[PDB]
């Protein structure tokens, strides 16, 4: 299948070179996989989700996304127009308030919730969790991420937007999960993207068009935007049977475009998420 005039990030992950505008992908499109978006919520009524999104848990007064961040990330995972895995099932877990903030205790609870909840869902091709959030180092937050991964969920997390070594941020610094940095449309490391030896992979993160609340769209930037590209790619690859939740991050790194990025500090991987599609 081919989506013409796609958002640049979708085109990038299906090409060996930058500057293309078509997103090439297998028609299976992540059908049968499930992705939990652990964030500010999801506006599940957005036409772009086609009835494939639903809120399953909130830690606040409402399950509504009053911010937009969660809806944007969910859109990059699996909306019709802006998504990597266009037929996946999306589950929203609201651990961040409508200002985009949340206590570590709540974020940890949300992770432990997903590890349990997945046992009540029909996700025959596998389960992914996308965490576009983080803050300063916490061994408890790292441990929760490690538990979620251990339970059989592919965990993708943002490296963070401090232009610093991700070793000092959580859950970015947990080695057992998939830590995602951001790149721009000219194959540069995004100027805000964290780096360091703990990064596993880069995905598109600057000027990413996706869904927004009020049934709208907008373009924003961050490692928060790169993370759902990788989460969506994982769901896509699991549906194709190419990899499993335990090994998806490694498989994605193994099959990545290598050496394409500029402004990568020595010691940081130069690997860009790639779906290896061949018609
Ligand atoms: Ca290349
Ligand atoms: Ca890792």
Whether 228 has a binding-site annotation, put simply, is no
**Contact at 8 Å (CB) between 228 and 37?**
yes
* CA 66 to ligand 1 centroid distance, Å: 39
CATH 1.10.150.120 holds for 1-279? no
Q: Rounded to 5 degrees, what are φ and ψ at 111?
A: -65, -45
What is the DSSP code (8-state) at residue 188? B
97 is in an annotated binding site: no
Taking every pair of C-alpha atoms in the chain, what is the biggest distance, in angstroms? Answer: 47
Q: Which helix (H) or strand (E) holds 207?
A: none
User: Residue 131: in which H helix or E strand, if any?
Assistant: strand 126-131
Residue in 200, 207, 105, 99 with CA at minimum distance from that of residue 157? 200
What residues does the ion ligand 2 have nearby, CB within 5 Å? 175, 200
Catalytic residue from among 138, 193, 221, 224: 224
Ligand 1 centroid to residue 11 C-alpha, Å:
13
| Backbone phi and psi for residue 50, each to the nearest 5 degrees, phi listed first | 55, 30
Q: Residue 45 in contact with residue 57, Cβ under 8 Å?
A: no
| Sign of the alpha-carbon torsion through 163, 92, 56, 122 | negative
> Encoding tokens for residue 216?
């709208």
Other C-beta atoms lying within 10 Å of the C-beta of residue 84: 30
Chain CA centroid to CA 76, Å: 8
Distance CA(42)–CA(141), nearest Å, equals 23
């Amino acid at each position: 299948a081919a989506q013409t005039n796609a958002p640049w990030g979708l085109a990038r992950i299906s090409s060996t070179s930058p500057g293309t505008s078509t997103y090439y992908y297998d028609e299976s499109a992540g059908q049968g996989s499930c992705v939990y978006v652990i964030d500010t919520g999801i506006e599940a009524s957005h036409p772009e989700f086609e009835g494939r999104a639903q809120m399953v848990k909130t830690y606040y007064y409402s399950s509504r996304d009053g911010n937009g961040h969660g809806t944007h990330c969910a859109g990059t995972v699996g909306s019709r127009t802006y998504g990597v895995a266009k037929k996946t099932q999306l589950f929203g877990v609201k651990v961040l308030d409508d200002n985009g903030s949340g206590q570590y205790s709540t974020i940890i609870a949300g992770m432990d919730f997903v590890a349990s909840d997945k046992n009540n869902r029909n996700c025959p091709k596998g389960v992914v969790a996308s965490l576009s959030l983080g803050g300063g180092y916490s061994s408890s937050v790292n441990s929760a991420a490690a538990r979620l991964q251990s339970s059989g969920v592919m965990v993708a997390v943002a490296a963070g937007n401090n232009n610093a070594d991700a070793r000092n941020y959580s859950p970015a610094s947990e080695p057992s999960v998939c830590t995602v940095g951001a790149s721009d449309r000219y194959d540069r490391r995004s100027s805000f993207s964290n780096y360091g030896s703990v990064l596993d992979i880069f995905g598109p993160g600057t000027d990413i068009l996706s869904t927004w609340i009020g049934g709208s769209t907008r373009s924003i930037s961050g490692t928060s935007m790169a993370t759902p590209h990788v989460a969506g790619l994982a769901a896509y690859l699991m549906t194709l049977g190419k990899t499993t939740a335990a090994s998806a991050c490694r498989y994605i790194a193994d099959t990545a475009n290598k050496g394409d990025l500029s402004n990568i500090p020595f010691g940081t991987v130069n690997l860009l998420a790639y779906n290896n599609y061949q018609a």
